[PDB]
């Protein structure tokens, strides 16, 4: 009863904080939705940059690989900010000690970003420019190493994740559970974190029961994906650290350096 209303509240805050929903993404990738402009090479990328409207700008005078790397960074930073406002809409999150709130966001944001990233990806590429662009996976592998390497595993994770067929209402709860994880390092009051988590997790288990009646082992399967995202994020961080040391003409945004750093 209260769980059902809890889940609805989390879902609304998710809808309030993130513009691209899985529902919208899927109705675009599948086809009242015009087909997105396909970015498959440098020319189409340049045209997409000139023609489409994006949320922002980037450093000028950069080779393509690096330029695309900064676009992604800029998008990551914006989602970190959306996730920060969303976690503030999670009942009690704002009750935690300041250090804990920070610690949860620091260690959980990329996990949430990668779970949500799947909504806009298929095996062939992903939506960009808020759904008006579609960048092909082949075009991305055609970029310079090590930049062509960052994304492949996100694609691998996404295609497996998408087979679970979650919808926005499931994802909103999944994302709160990821942020309210009691296993982060340096947590001060973990019992207080796990108390808020258990509520979200109870709301989720029940929610999936209602929303996926003919899917028996979905709940635990979801908790396992959380394990997958954590490994995905550890790898991603190492990739960034190496690019940082290996690519002198590139730099990590301040807020992102502060995240990849400690982890
Ligand atoms: C691959 O993403 C893009 C590729 C080309 C163009 Cl024109 C735009 C985007 C974009 O807007 N991405 C925003 C969403 C996004 C953000 C981060 C990531 S990532 O976590 O994989 N980090 C990456 N950093 N650089 C990357 C490039 C060099 C592939 S991937 C993937 C996707
Ligand atoms: C902004 O954070 C700081 C603010 C004052 C001082 Cl004395 C130090 C830091 C710092 O070392 N933060 C490192 C971690 C961090 C860096 C940047 C960002 S942000 O860019 O997302 N927010 C900012 N807003 N304004 C900023 C500049 C103009 C100070 S940074 C978040 C987190």
UniProtKB/Swiss-Prot annotation:
Heterodimer with the retinoid X receptor. Interacts (via domain NR LBD) with CRY1 and CRY2 in a ligand-dependent manner. Its main location: nucleus. Coiled coil: none annotated. Residues 37-262 form the NR LBD domain. It is found in: Nucleus. One of its GO terms (cellular component) is chromatin. It comes from the Eukaryota. The keyword DNA repair does not apply. Ligand-activated transcription factor key mediator of energy metabolism in adipose tissues. Receptor that binds peroxisome proliferators such as hypolipidemic drugs and fatty acids. Has a preference for poly-unsaturated fatty acids, such as gamma-linoleic acid and eicosapentanoic acid. Once activated by a ligand, the receptor binds to promoter elements of target genes. Regulates the peroxisomal beta-oxidation pathway of fatty acids. Functions as transcription activator for the acyl-CoA oxidase gene. Decreases expression of NPC1L1 once activated by a ligand. Keywords: Activator, DNA-binding, Metal-binding, Nucleus, Receptor, Transcription, Transcription regulation, Ubl conjugation, Zinc, Zinc-finger. Belongs to the nuclear hormone receptor family. NR1 subfamily. Disulfide bonds: none annotated. This is Peroxisome proliferator-activated receptor delta. One of its GO terms (molecular function) is nuclear receptor activity. One of its GO terms (biological process) is generation of precursor metabolites and energy. Ubiquitous with maximal levels in placenta and skeletal muscle. The keyword Ubl conjugation applies. 'Lys-48'-linked polyubiquitinated; leading to proteasomal degradation. Deubiquitinated and stabilized by OTUD3.
